[PDB]
Assembly symmetry: C2
Homo-oligomer: 568 residues x 2
């Protein structure tokens, strides 16, 4: 019985949800910008001469839209606490809330299974803020506890399986996925959140990375491209929800991917400390394939580590070639790209970024552009291998059998930590297994102001990428979401008319929840829509189809230690 992914969520640069992320990837968007003014005054620290001492020669990053915004009330927390904790802890909370909404579940549905939490992190820089003040006695210390990221999730969501934070550098996300799958196979838990987060909250990181000559000079990751002399740091936060295949089937979950294999290892003593070992990479990927029960012949995409380093990208290919020794390579063509070329190197969340792209490419059956490699690296010699860099937007053509019929698509994601820790994962596409009006559309939120923005965004989604939707699916999906105090309901028959109705409210009932409200006076729809608004429970018609609506629009209260302004 194999492990499946049933939900995913995240934020990446220039993308505050996965629908935007998908658009950026199709358009081949370059999401890297210069250091925003509001993080820190990068001039204090900048100097393009890499020989300059105590200075950074690069000034770019993949930035999240706002990393200071948080809804502390929602998460049972004061403002002052929120100002003193790393935004990584804060954002990953929201991410995991959105994960449950994409899976179509909730704290309460998950309360009778044992849920674990595994999250990867590699930097904790926020804690550098306020040290002088706290020592002087005029302030309180900030925290960046890794464990806190996991533990606060486990607390809030009532997950009582393992709660573990791990650092394997760039591979942390996939290591977390690895351990989460093992935790399930071994019985530590039955469901698991596996994720990773990284926020660039402090200039010191840029000084660090420049001093090591790690940063590219043009601020890009030319994944397998010519003239790549480093990478560009990127922010991010993602997570996936994991379950057994059996339990997913039984709960009528939407399966996004089957986890065929995970594997992790380390370079040992190769060329030097924190230099990549082609050999270790090959053994890793080779074992991954054998565990997967899959041949390179059947491999459909390869999401590469793809840092964009002159020497590092070759090492990665050599690595693959080694894992492919002993198999028949003739005729075989495997497309290869890296999400880093679009968003940059999201560090502890790089695997989550890479995993999500693959997840999205499965659902939309397209291969997307990998950027900045018009000219391949001259060290490469790709033509001797099966690998072809996918520079263009293309349909993801499956492969067939003897009998000429199509198979589920496959993909393979690698992530190689700078300090030697490697991870690799093998994914298979999920191929799935009606109901007639009038339907009802329930909505909830913490207060009025949030219910407004929710309704609003839900309305916009019906006009945009979600008019092609099934209105039955839209009712069921919404009825999986956790109900809150301020409620709303509207009976309807088509997407068209639902969006119609709601628009008119904005420019259709509305109530506040009541715990001892009168039960629905019968399954007939306009009786349910009332049952909601007063605050009765009502469960979706089990086994209904489902869709990705927009997640809860959290409040955006600025939380940021004031004594962090000294770097602006």
């Amino acid at each position: 019985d194999e492990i499946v992914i049933v939900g995913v969520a995240g934020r990446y640069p220039k993308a505050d949800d996965l629908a935007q992320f998908w658009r950026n990837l199709r358009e081949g968007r370059d999401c890297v910008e210069e250091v925003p003014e509001d993080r820190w005054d990068h001039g204090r620290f900048y100097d393009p001469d890499p020989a300059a001492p105590g200075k950074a020669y690069a000034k770019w990053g993949g930035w999240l839209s706002d990393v200071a915004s948080f809804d502390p009330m929602f998460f049972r927390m004061s403002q002052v606490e929120a100002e003193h904790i790393d935004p990584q802890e804060r954002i990953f909370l929201q991410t995991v809330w959105h994960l449950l909404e994409d899976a179509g579940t909730s704290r309460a549905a998950l309360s009778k299974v044992r849920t674990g939490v595994f999250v990867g992190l590699m930097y904790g820089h926020y804690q550098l803020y306020g040290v002088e003040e706290a020592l002087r006695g005029t302030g309180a210390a900030t925290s960046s506890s890794y464990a806190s990221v996991a533990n606060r999730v486990s607390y809030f969501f009532d997950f009582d399986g393992p709660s573990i934070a791990l650092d394997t550098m760039c591979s942390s996300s996939l290591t977390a996925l690895h351990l989460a799958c093992r935790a399930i196979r071994d019985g530590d838990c039955e469901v698991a959140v596996a994720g990773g987060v990284n926020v660039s909250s402090h200039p010191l990181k840029y000084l660090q990375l420049a001093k090591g000559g790690f940063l590219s000079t043009d601020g890009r990751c030319r994944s397998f491209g010519e003239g790549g002399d480093g990478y560009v740091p990127a922010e991010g936060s993602g997570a996936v929800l994991l379950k057994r295949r059996s339990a997913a089937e039984a709960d009528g979950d939407r399966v996004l991917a089957v986890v065929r294999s995970t594997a992790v290892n380390h370079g040992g003593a190769g060329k030097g400390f924190s230099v990549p070992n082609p050999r270790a990479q090959g053994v890793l990927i080779g074992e991954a394939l054998e565990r997967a029960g899959l041949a390179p012949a059947d491999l459909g995409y390869l999401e590469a580590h793809g840092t964009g380093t002159s020497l590092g990208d070759p090492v990665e290919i050599t690595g693959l070639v080694r894992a492919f020794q002993g198999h028949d390579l003739t005729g075989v063509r495997i497309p290869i790209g890296s999400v880093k070329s679009g968003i940059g190197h999201a560090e502890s969340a790089a695997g989550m970024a890479a995993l999500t792209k693959v997840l999205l490419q499965f659902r939309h059956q397209e291969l997307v552009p990998s950027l900045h490699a018009e000219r391949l690296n001259p060290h490469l010699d790709l033509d001797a291998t099966p690998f072809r860099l996918q520079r263009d937007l293309a349909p993801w053509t499956p492969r067939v059998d003897a009998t000429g019929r199509a198979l589920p698509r496959t993909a393979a994601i690698s992530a190689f930590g700078a300090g030697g820790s490697n991870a690799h994962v093998i994914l298979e596409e999920s191929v799935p297994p009606a109901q007639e009006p009038p339907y009802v559309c329930a909505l909830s939120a913490r207060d009025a102001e949030r219910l407004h923005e929710h309704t609003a965004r839900t309305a916009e989604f019906l006009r945009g990428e979600g008019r092609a939707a099934h209105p039955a699916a839209v009712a069921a999906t919404l009825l999986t979401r956790e109900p809150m105090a301020h409620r709303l309901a509207v009976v309807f028959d088509t997407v068209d008319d639902l969006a119609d109705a709601l628009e008119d409210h904005l420019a259709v009932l509305t109530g506040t929840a009541s715990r001892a409200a009168a039960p629905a006076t019968g399954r007939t729809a306009p009786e349910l829509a009332e049952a909601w608004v007063r605050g009765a429970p009502v469960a979706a018609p089990a086994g209904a189809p489902r869709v990705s609506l927009p997640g809860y629009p959290f409040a955006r209260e600025r939380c940021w230690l004031p004594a962090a302004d000294a770097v602006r």
Copy 2:
């Protein structure tokens, strides 16, 4: 079916630079807590005995490692400057792993044919706070405390190409790592594993953070299950164990320290507050661990408790235990309970390692040691309604009998509960040594090496001193055998010897200049002539030329002092700000 076992352990704890000293301290019931040392920081700048004072620490105590700045960078192929710029947790853990391999009777090279994983728990990284201003102003370089670096650097240097993972679950980190290491081995990620944890109190910020949250006890003690405990005291430590399938240990003739019957981890979920201990979840965890172990509470010999010494936490721990033992017949069952924290303090990410090490030593010496500061019990635990009795006195660890009235292998259970909710429990079982093949007869060769002459000198001295002290009872063949499992280095010493006393005599002579016809010295050279035969003089002469000598198959082993690393100060110069 194939069990995991522990085949070596190593550690430094407060007032204990090695485990022999640790054992002495546990055995005597030594209180190892002290005031903040002058050479760490000026605690005057931050102390106010009033808890109500804001921006202040109302306590001034900890469990301190004797010296955390010291490192042997040349040994580990790193520059002096690089060393100053990384956290002492990374450096100390490297030496700990080195000493672990020596305690297990193995080496990088012996391990190079199996896949070895590394799993290390940490929860603070304070060294990186130093030198942040200077680095921003272009004056200096950034310090590092990367957690992955602690594992990865071990993996690199020892050539361990299994999983290399650092992890934070706070106080339970060490046992969480033990748990992940055990499952990596079962699942095939590796065959052998290093599991450990490390914690260094490098920066005064921790004491402010903890004072602000009221975590610090006001006397600077962990009064584990004792009256008037009002918090804990931080302590420093580094520890690691080496893990293996039983079959591989038996095959390799390892000394087995304990069988790992079971491990478990979980979380409190949503209980009465973030970071408030949940006895329901503790109960579940322990119950499960007992089940996976195949063990009934009646068979449990000792419980090394979390034992933090808080008024909330200690009664909660007892309630968790009672919850786990519900649904079991507990008639005439009596289980001794204690906590290492009562002697050294709460070693935070290394707490589980201190705890685990304490049990392993108990197994080895078959004694139960005093738990301190509970002359009067905490009256709100109601222990007497339970099986548990605080072990306040040194006492022999009498085993349990069966039906035949035969002695059973001793068992122990160890808990660690992280402040944020991540819990871990482990059940261990003592190992009955296999029947011994017969010892080699004298003479024997004692073969020592070190990276240079000054190191070999210290090593020779430490070895003679051990052989006059606790090592006088060691079988001489065992002393010989053990040293021959150690990785050979450039500077060589050898002695032919019949007994321990006469070996010490020769080593002392060599140290005094007198020297001996019996002591040979030299520096290795490449392709040196191997031994001309297996007599000891022949072996001795080959070793001194640079030739390896094999340890005899099946030989029994003993623990001898580990490699005496050089002690070069590596402390950022900018860190001297926080002192006078």
